[PDB]
Design a protein around this nucleic acid. Structure first.
Ligand SMILES: [Zn+2]
Length: 178
DNA sequence: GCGCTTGCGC
């Protein structure tokens, strides 16, 4: 019942233009959807050091009360591919290792290649047993339906959503193909 | 506010 502003979503998860911010929408499904929601990064503003959207998720993981003797799948739809350089990639892996009853699924709207260590981040997450993928129309539409406060208005894709989505999917497969 | 947007400039 905490929903995102339409303009926020469409100007953040768009895959042709970027923002100086990151959003992460998450779901938790037990296996044999318990919790959902979304958050954004804390901006580094020295005049703090910032906190990436990934690390904020791990911070709230205790509040989700995951039964240690049950199996969960966690899904992120994240506006930027996770970084390596600021340590997001390492910490997620560390968390996955220390838990192991959690299985993770990550869809990114665009690749954070500003980090020149982006290839190592994605491959490091894949090796940890995360699924790393590019968001398509269906994942955008599902996030729209599930987290955006649309007031009953169905998802309207932006121009060239698919060209971009395929081009990025192409890039990511090349990276993970090792 | 204001811009252009892979927080920073003004
Ligand atoms: Zn990061």
């Amino acid at each position: 019942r905490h929903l995102m502003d339409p303009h926020i979503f469409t100007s953040n998860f768009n895959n042709g233009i970027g923002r100086h911010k990151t959003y992460l929408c998450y779901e938790v499904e037990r296996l044999d959807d318990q919790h959902r929601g979304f958050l954004h990064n804390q901006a580094k503003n020295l005049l703090f050091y910032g906190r990436h959207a990934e690390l904020r998720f791990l911070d709230l993981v205790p509040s989700l009360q995951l039964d240690p003797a049950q199996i969960y799948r966690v899904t992120w739809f994240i506006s930027w591919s996770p970084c390596f350089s600021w340590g997001c990639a390492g910490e997620v892996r560390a968390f996955l290792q220390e838990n192991t009853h959690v299985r993770l699924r990550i869809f990114a709207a665009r690749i954070y290649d500003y980090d020149p260590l982006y290839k190592e981040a994605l491959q490091m997450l894949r090796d940890a047993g995360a699924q790393v993928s590019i968001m398509t129309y269906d994942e955008f539409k599902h996030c729209w339906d599930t987290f955006v406060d649309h007031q009953g208005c169905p998802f309207q894709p932006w121009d060239g959503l698919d060209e971009h989505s395929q081009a990025l999917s192409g890039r990511l497969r090349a990276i993970l193909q090792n």
